[PDB]
Amino acid sequence: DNQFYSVEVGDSTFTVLKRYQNLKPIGSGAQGIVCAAYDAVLDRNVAIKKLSRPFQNQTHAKRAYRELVLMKCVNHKNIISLLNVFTPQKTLEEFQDVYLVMELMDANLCQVIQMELDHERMSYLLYQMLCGIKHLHSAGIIHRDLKPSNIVVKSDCTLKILDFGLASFMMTPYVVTRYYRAPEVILGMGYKENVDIWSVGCIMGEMVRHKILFPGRDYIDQWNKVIEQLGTPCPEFMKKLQPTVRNYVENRPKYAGLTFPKLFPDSLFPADSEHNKLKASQARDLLSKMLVIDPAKRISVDDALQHPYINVWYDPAEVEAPPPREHTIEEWKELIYKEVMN
Ligand SMILES: CCC(=O)c1c(-c2ccccc2)c2cc(Cl)ccc2c(=O)n1Cc1ccc(C(=O)O)cc1
Numbered sequence: 001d002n003q004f005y006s007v008e009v010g011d012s013t014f015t016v017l018k019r020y021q022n023l024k025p026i027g028s029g030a031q032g033i034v035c036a037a038y039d040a041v042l043d044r045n046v047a048i049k050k051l052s053r054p055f056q057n058q059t060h061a062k063r064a065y066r067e068l069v070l071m072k073c074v075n076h077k078n079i080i081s082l083l084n085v086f087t088p089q090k091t092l093e094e095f096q097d098v099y100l101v102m103e104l105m106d107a108n109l110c111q112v113i114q115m116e117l118d119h120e121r122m123s124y125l126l127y128q129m130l131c132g133i134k135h136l137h138s139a140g141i142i143h144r145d146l147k148p149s150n151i152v153v154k155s156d157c158t159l160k161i162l163d164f165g166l167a168s169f170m171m172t173p174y175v176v177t178r179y180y181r182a183p184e185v186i187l188g189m190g191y192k193e194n195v196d197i198w199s200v201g202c203i204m205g206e207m208v209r210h211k212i213l214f215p216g217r218d219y220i221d222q223w224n225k226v227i228e229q230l231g232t233p234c235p236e237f238m239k240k241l242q243p244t245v246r247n248y249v250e251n252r253p254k255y256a257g258l259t260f261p262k263l264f265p266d267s268l269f270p271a272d273s274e275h276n277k278l279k280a281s282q283a284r285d286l287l288s289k290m291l292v293i294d295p296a297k298r299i300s301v302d303d304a305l306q307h308p309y310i311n312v313w314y315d316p317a318e319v320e321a322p323p324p325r326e327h328t329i330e331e332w333k334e335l336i337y338k339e340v341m342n
Helices: 058-073 109-113 119-138 195-209 219-230 243-251 274-290 301-306 329-340
Strands: 004-009 012-017 020-029 032-039 044-052 082-086 097-103 151-153 159-161
Touching: 004 020, 012 020, 012 032, 012 044, 012 082, 012 097, 020 044, 058 082, 058 097, 058 329, 109 151, 109 195, 119 159, 119 195, 119 274, 119 301, 195 274, 195 301, 274 301
Parallel strands: none
Antiparallel strands: 004 012, 020 032, 032 044, 044 097, 082 097, 151 159
């Protein structure tokens, strides 16, 4: 007569509260598998994320702890909601796994990126990304690693960001996706809030091109793809780089870059009606202001929200919503356990 039961999901066991039924794996990330499930108590579908021994190293431990704390403070429609948290283990010494129960949506932004979207849906998704990032920024959280695999959407075009970013070493096969990180993250130069604007620009550009904008095996290839398309940065940008980094950037092959009309031609946009022709030119204008290498010249979150492509959605309830170190593995274990048990 225990509150829990176990089922096999791949080569992992999910041990969950009996209220959660008919689990089905929907995806996997760096922290492992997420299942969809029916919650018999709430009478709705939910997502269940299993953290296996998150205290096992600093990198897992710090993300798990941060995720728990921030999910409990933050309440915004464009940030994914935490519904419940549990461990099946009964004592700290027995403690192994943490299960996060989240609201469930319909699809990954990666799936939406593959679609041809009208301007109304495209702009509304972007508005919602900006709103969620704005709310984060107002709580002092700068995400720094926004990427489409970690944003989810519903059939009615509502959007939620799944994680809180952060930007080290783990011995797993999992490969971290870096295509969406800002120049200042890539070149390790320090950053402000509009570091996240670059990532939105990369996603928007990909929604249009249906190809990843700046792929690369690692930061070297990636920087190559940046300057080859946007062109070599100006001198005032060069001055803000650490000395070893500056020499490297100043010595790469030079490129003029492409115009934004060439980068995102009208053939990529809905452009049959006068409405869509105007929207395409507006979409291209915002792209030209987000995909800007020098953060001092890159558009801010607030100005982006005011941009004509975006501002048709503006709602102060949504935009100006009220805002909310290191240890050993044993220390992290108790921190996380304490958080879990409230
Ligand atoms: C590819 C999975 C995916 O996009 C996803 C993930 C996800 C994101 C990255 C890694 C792991 C999980 C997710 C994770 C948490 Cl914590 C909460 C909600 C979701 C979610 O709503 N979806 C959409 C979704 C929901 C059901 C199905 C389905 O029924 O097939 C497909 C997509």
